[PDB]
Amino acid sequence: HTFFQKPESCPPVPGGSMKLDIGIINENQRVSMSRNIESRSTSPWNYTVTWDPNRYPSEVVQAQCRNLGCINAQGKEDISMNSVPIQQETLVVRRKHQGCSVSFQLEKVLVTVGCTCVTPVIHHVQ
Template sequence: MAASMGATMPHFTLLLFALGVSTMLSAHGMSTEHPKKDCQPPIDLKFKSVLNVTVNIRRKSLGLEKDVSKRSLTPWYYSHDIDNNRFPSMISVAKCRHAQCLDAQGNLDLSVNSVPIKQEILVLRWKMIGCTPSFSLEKQMVNVGCTCVRPIYKM
């Protein structure tokens, strides 16, 4: 449990930082979306209209991520879920290549099923409510890989 919490802590810290920056921008009338025509321009023009943020997340990579998805008995590929009103705007999503798993020789094994492994992540979502940008922290389920399971037989 502690190991899994440590892995998600940088994401949570990053989302809290983004929420703080977004709140600051919102409080000063800044938005990444063009305001509606009937909205008043921001009153306080002392703040910069662009905020540069650099986030360096260093992690030791073994370089096996792509290799595992191909060597698995339930191979998968990644697609990209893009939403410009969400942070992060792009999330890689695993999709199982087959409905069944592979045997040791690489042939489909009809006795077991391939299913996605799901992970819940936190995302920052924003939308305009009238002339005010609104920010919310949301949970989102993401497929991160695939695994083999025995099928469920209904009697």
């Protein structure tokens, strides 16, 4: 069984659709990060704002590491270290149909949120 499955003893609903209640729980929260984190980082990154009007959130910001290496104390690239992305799974809502027939469906989006500086690994399988 899955999370969205209603108990088997319950009467069936036409279309197999579920009730989505109004309002987003804890909507008032906002991300709090160090000022200019993406630029002050030794593994700096750039952002790409992706837009979809039939997706909630409509704007999904994607990060991309600026360099292969990490930035040293002198402000130069160090290729002995690697800037690597941090990717996280998220849920967005896809808006379907139109007007009175509007329905919603969950969608999994992989978001690259930022980069970190790692010591490289020599992989056993290339």
